[PDB]
Every structure is written in C-alpha cells, then in structure tokens.
C-alpha cells in the first residue's frame, strides 16, 4: 500500500532535511508520499518532528505538491 515519509530520527525545528532523516512506511493517516523524498532534501521543517512521526505537507517550509 501507500507509503508516506516518516521521521527516522528526531528532526529539530528549522533544520534542513537530509536523506538519513526520512524513512518510508505504510501508516495512517497518509502523509507526504514516499516518492517525494528526493525533493524534500534540503527543505526545512517548521516545527520539531519527533522520531516516527509522519511528515505532513504543513510541516515543511515551501512544500507544495
């Protein structure tokens, strides 16, 4: 089924995303699609994102699908 991006470590506020930060899992509710990982790289989050949190569109500065 449909995988989303999930935080693979705590991602602090205002921190640019790296590939080691993002895993993919089938979770609900559904978040940013796992195929968008590659383009989230270097975008910043606007809040701290705890380990295992699904990344949602409103958490990433500048994201529009």
UniProtKB/Swiss-Prot annotation:
Detected in blood serum (at protein level). Keywords: Antifreeze protein, Secreted. Disulfide bonds: none annotated. Residues 4-63 form the AFP-like domain. Signal peptide: none annotated. CDD domains: Antifreeze_III. InterPro entries: AFP_Neu5c_C (IPR006190), AFP_Neu5c_C_sf (IPR036732), Antifreeze_III (IPR006013). Coiled coil: none annotated. One of its GO terms (cellular component) is extracellular region. The record marks 9, 14, 18, 44 as: Important for ice-binding. It is found in: Secreted. Belongs to the type-III AFP family. Contributes to protect fish blood from freezing at subzero sea water temperatures. Lowers the blood freezing point. Binds to nascent ice crystals and prevents further growth. This is Type-3 ice-structuring protein HPLC 12.
